[PDB]
Amino acid sequence: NAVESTLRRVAKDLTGLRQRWALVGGFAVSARSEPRFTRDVDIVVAVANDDAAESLVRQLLTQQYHLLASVEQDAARRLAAVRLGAVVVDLLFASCGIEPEIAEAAEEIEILPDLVAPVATTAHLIAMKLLARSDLRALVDAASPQDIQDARKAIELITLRGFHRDRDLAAEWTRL
């Protein structure tokens, strides 16, 4: 209940600030395949640089959220994600490296009554789950062949940009 309310507000809010965002969590997956909800809202946001990110989060913290975590990294984009409180919202700026592909690529879908929201493509969802690690099994069982192709591409572009941790993701999959 808190979860749908949280999702509604942040969507209101992100749209409000004309951001390029995309659901990549429980609702997203549920939309692209079968019911796999969580008590977390996972969203990607395409933003220019760390200033953009910082600024966005400041603007959101004037609203009715609190900052529960900054996730940082040694690379050119310091600020990978943040986690906010209202139920928790993870915002991903540069966790996977294809945030802006994902957000261009998302499609608007009506998730709840009179809530349309952009939703990561199945292929992207597959990419991201692999990287985080039956959320995945679901997405794959559900995925069309072209879906699988796009996923491989998405995998590749993550690896190129070198957010692949140090993992052969291509590999990790054929296994699973």
Author numbering: 2 to 87, 95 to 141, 151 to 193
Question: What text appears in the publication on this structure?
Answer:
The Mycobacterium tuberculosis NTase toxin family, MenT, modifies tRNAs to block translation. MenT toxin activity can be stringently regulated by diverse MenA antitoxins. MenT and AbiEii toxins share four highly conserved NTase motifs scattered throughout their structures, proposed to facilitate co-ordination of metals (motifs I and II), base stacking, and transfer of nucleotides to tRNA isoacceptors (motif III), and to contribute to catalysis (motif IV). Our study reveals a conserved mechanism for the control of tuberculosis toxins, and demonstrates how active site auto-phosphorylation can regulate the activity of widespread NTases.
